[PDB]
Design goal:
alpha/beta, 34 helices, binds potassium ion, DNA-binding, RNA binding, ATP hydrolysis activity, repeat
DNA sequence: AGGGTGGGTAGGGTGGGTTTTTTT
């Protein structure tokens, strides 16, 4: 390199180094033998045969299977029964507590306004009594007017725990047990306490209603429908919302009630043709709001001397933030002392100063009155660092303080049941992410330490990468964290952002429609007889970017799920009949055909989110040791899940003590494992409803002849995805081998530490497959598994056979290639064509394989092909 | 689009080191 500047020299040696590296990887080129007398046999027959539902998802809509049919006798039974339940101590006390709520004074306006209108918006101002009292007001009103039999109410809750919890509280406030022929009940995936057939209040999640629309597009036998917590722009909540908006004309006798929370409720009101709204003031203790300047001024802190719509907005915001930065600082010198202001300009962004949180906790526990403390942090790292920072002091080491970390990965199953450790007078410091703000409630909070930021998900629409980064807390989220002071006593709130950022905060977070893929929603649109996909998405409130819809349509066209002409599904019927991701449905289809049902159902339930593992506090090395120990030599996270589920089944059949010892030993949660087992039950229910298996049992030997074989299971794993394949590269590294991965789309990627093949070196093959790509510090694959070249050769895609300066090379999707004799390559191409014919014919009309007539059963040949391989 | 057996008598603003919450 005679010339080139400094930075360019590394690009010169990087060009030569890239040349020698890529020519080395091409020099390897896997190996793919595929020799032996198999070639003799496979060719022969190759010429011969060439010349010659589930009734609404396992009755998850059992309450929907009704037709109202009111009668006066039942109305009289409800009226006299209400007169009898009036004389009851528990009922009287519950009614007094219900009188102590602000919504009780708003009973007449809500009841009358709901009865005289089809659409109604109720700005809740939580904490209030909207959710636990509006349905009781409606049902009690219908019962007290001789028309209680025709009343049938259904309310949608965004979270499962919120649905079942509100169901329990409402059932308790009526002096009744939940379900079992009583007034109030709930219904969620594979768990239901159904109420009465008439005059009943049923709580559920939105996915339950979307599951109902596949059997009743007009929602018969449903008098009143309620959408709660619509301020949280859950995707299903918006989709159902606009679907009901379209349903208003076809159903005049339907009453719809939306409930926001006194911020953008005027927007929801303006959506439904300027429908009237009703504001409930709610009840909350006073609470105080301290900001960063008030914190540093208070405790006298001395530091240690240290295309996305939101991203496009946060950039320019920073700009004007800079324009607002000096003057604000000047004003600060008119309000507070100079030291704390100098600390303010010395404060660092992109990182919440955990030392300030520690000193704050110390001052609160040492000088303020009794009460528990709740801390919000962006993620796991800050919780671990803050925990190690608090436990490093001798004052917190005593048994007079309780520190509880909260996280989805934290085994909160054992954290919900407690209170057997220490008496009162003990500080309950709960260091949590935003989970404590969304569902779990210890509810004994007096002090809230709101962290500055929170990790949020943003999907890229051009590079096809789901990203996640800690953004500034939304003003609604901060209002919730302030509302976390609860009805215990006057609390305190500590926001770790200056009063400048508080002026440049977005009113709300962006809806989930703009930050998640849209394949599931596209199939649900094309399956609910909603016509044009992009058109209905245009009807949807805040329509998504056009490029995202185009990309989702292209993706569904790649999988042969939608017609290239218009939205027509040749196989999207079977996929949409499955309540999971489309690639997961393809996975359970290929697993249902190949008679390896159970492991593919386990891997599918684990891949439809909800991974069965828990990591406690700060001991995660043992967690990775037990996980990698369960991996054995499979080099697969999914096969690790299979072995974990098998060990859990054997330990279950062994004894009850051995199950608890098993989950305790390998860091498992029997709740998640049980839920995934039920998910296997529902998957097998749908597969039997479609005709792929012979019985409901996922462990049926008719559909599990090959279930105990790693090769074909990994083959089904590669067949389920089809793309999302990554290349494994071998390097000399620091004199020793290291990991190098590529995806041909995002470029250089790496494996996330939560997997098993993080530091693995001994691989049988040089190809992996993944499901979740995430953009953080670098592109990470949260789950991956090795795949034999013969496996991906059967389900990869187009095949090209072109060689240069080497033996004949087979390329799937062009960029993956490996050398082998051509006379075998073309044979594999023809056998691939016949395989595609039999797969399509098997897809349009499914039925068991019925081995072994050998007339339409040549798949044992391919199974034997995959069973034979080499390094 | 990358390495230390390119070198550091080019430089480090060129770039090479971590786990969020949810439902069907
Ligand atoms: K260098
Ligand atoms: K260099």
């Amino acid at each position: 390199p005679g010339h080139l500047k400094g930075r360019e020299i590394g690009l010169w040696y990087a060009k030569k180094q890239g040349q020698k590296n890529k020519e080395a990887e091409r020099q390897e080129r896997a190996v793919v033998h595929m020799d032996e007398r198999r070639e003799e046999q496979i060719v022969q027959l190759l010429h011969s045969v060439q010349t010659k539902t589930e009734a609404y998802i396992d009755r998850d809509s059992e309450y929907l299977l009704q037709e109202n049919e009111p009668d006066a006798t039942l109305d009289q039974q409800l009226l006299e029964d209400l007169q009898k339940k009036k004389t009851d101590l528990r009922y009287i006390e519950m009614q007094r507590f219900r009188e102590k709520l602000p919504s009780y004074g708003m009973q007449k306006e809500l009841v009358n306004m709901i009865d005289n209108h089809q659409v109604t918006v109720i700005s809740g101002e939580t904490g209030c009594g909207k959710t636990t009292q509006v349905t009781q007001f409606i049902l009690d009103n219908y019962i007290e007017r001789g028309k209680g039999s025709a009343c049938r109410i259904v309310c949608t809750q965004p979270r499962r725990i919120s649905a079942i919890s509100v169901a329990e509280r409402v059932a308790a406030e009526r002096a009744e047990s939940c379900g079992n022929g009583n007034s109030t009940g709930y219904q969620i995936r594979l768990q239901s306490r159904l109420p009465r057939k008439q005059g009943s209040i049923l709580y559920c999640t939105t996915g339950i209603i979307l599951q109902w629309l596949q059997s009743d597009p007009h929602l018969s036998s449903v008098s009143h429908i309620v959408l709660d917590e619509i301020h949280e722009r859950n995707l299903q909540s918006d989709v159902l919302m606009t679907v009901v908006k379209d349903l208003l004309s076809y159903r005049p006798d339907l009453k719809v009630v939306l409930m926001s929370a006194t911020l953008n409720a005027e927007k929801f009101s303006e959506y439904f043709g300027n429908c009237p709204m009703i504001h409930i003031p709610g009840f909350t203790f006073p609470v105080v709001e301290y900001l960063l300047e008030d914190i540093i001024e208070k405790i006298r802190y001395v530091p240690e001397q240290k295309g996305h719509v939101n991203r496009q907005e946060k950039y320019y915001y920073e700009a004007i933030y800079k324009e607002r930065w000096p003057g604000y600082l000047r004003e600060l010198r008119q309000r507070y002392s100079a030291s704390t202001v100098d600390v303010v300009e010395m404060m660092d962004d992109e990182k919440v100063d955990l030392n300030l949180i520690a000193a704050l906790i110390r001052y609160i526990v040492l000088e303020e009155e009794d009460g528990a403390i709740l801390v919000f942090l962006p993620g796991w790292d800050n919780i671990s660092t803050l925990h190690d920072l608090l436990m490093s002091q001798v004052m917190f080491k005593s048994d007079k303080f309780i520190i509880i970390p909260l996280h989805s990965l934290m085994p909160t199953v054992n954290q919900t049941q407690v209170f057997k450790r220490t008496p009162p007078g003990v500080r309950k410091i709960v260091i949590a992410t935003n989970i404590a703000e969304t569902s779990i409630t210890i509810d004994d909070v007096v002090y809230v330490i709101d962290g500055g930021k929170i990790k949020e998900t943003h999907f890229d629409t051009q590079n096809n990468i789901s990203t996640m980064s800690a953004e500034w807390v939304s003003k609604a989220n901060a209002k919730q964290r302030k509302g976390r002071a609860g009805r215990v006593q006057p609390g305190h709130c500590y926001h770790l952002y200056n009063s400048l950022r508080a002026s440049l905060l977005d009113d709300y977070q962006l809806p989930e429609i703009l930050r998640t893929p849209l394949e599931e929603l596209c199939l649900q649109i094309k399956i609910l007889r909603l016509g044009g996909i992009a058109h209905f998405l245009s009807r949807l409130m805040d329509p998504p970017s056009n490029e995202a819809v185009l990309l989702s349509i292209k993706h569904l066209m790649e999988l042969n799920a939608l017609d290239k002409q218009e939205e027509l599904t040749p196989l999207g019927v079977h996929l949409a009949r499955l309540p999971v991701e489309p690639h997961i449905g393809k996975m359970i289809l290929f697993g249902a055909l190949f008679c390896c049902l159970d492991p593919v159902l386990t891997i599918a339930a684990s891949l439809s989110f909800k991974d069965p593992f828990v990591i406690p506090l700060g001991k995660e090395k043992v967690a990775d040791a037990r996980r990698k120990e369960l991996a054995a030599a499979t080099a697969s996270d999914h096969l690790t899940v299979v072995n974990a589920f098998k060990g859990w089944e054997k330990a279950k059949q062994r004894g009850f003590r051995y199950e608890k010892d098993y989950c305790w030993e390998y860091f498992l949660s029997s709740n998640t494992l049980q839920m995934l087992h039920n998910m296997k039950g529902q998957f097998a229910e749908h597969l039997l409803g479609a005709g792929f298996v012979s019985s409901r049992n996922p462990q049926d030997p008719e559909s599990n002849i090959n279930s105990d074989n790693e090769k074909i299971i990994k083959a089904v794993i590669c067949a389920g995805l089809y793309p999302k394949v990554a290349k494994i590269r071998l390097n000399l590294g620091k004199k020793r081998k290291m990991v190098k991965v590529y995806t041909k789309t995002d470029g250089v990627v790496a494996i996330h530490p939560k997997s098993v093949n993080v530091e693995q070196t001994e691989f049988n093959y040089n190809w992996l497959i993944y499901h979740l790509k995430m953009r953080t510090s670098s592109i990470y694959l949260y789950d991956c598994t090795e795949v034999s070249p013969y496996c991906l050769l059967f389900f990869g895609g187009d095949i090209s056979i072109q060689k240069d300066n080497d033996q004949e090379t087979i390329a799937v999707d062009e960029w993956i290639i490996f050398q082998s004799p051509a006379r075998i390559a073309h044979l594999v191409k023809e056998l691939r064509k016949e395989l595609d014919i039999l797969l399509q014919e098997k897809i349009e009309s499914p039925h068991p394989v019925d081995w072994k007539d050998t007339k339409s059963r040549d798949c044992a040949v391919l199974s034997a092909i995959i069973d034979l391989i080499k390094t």
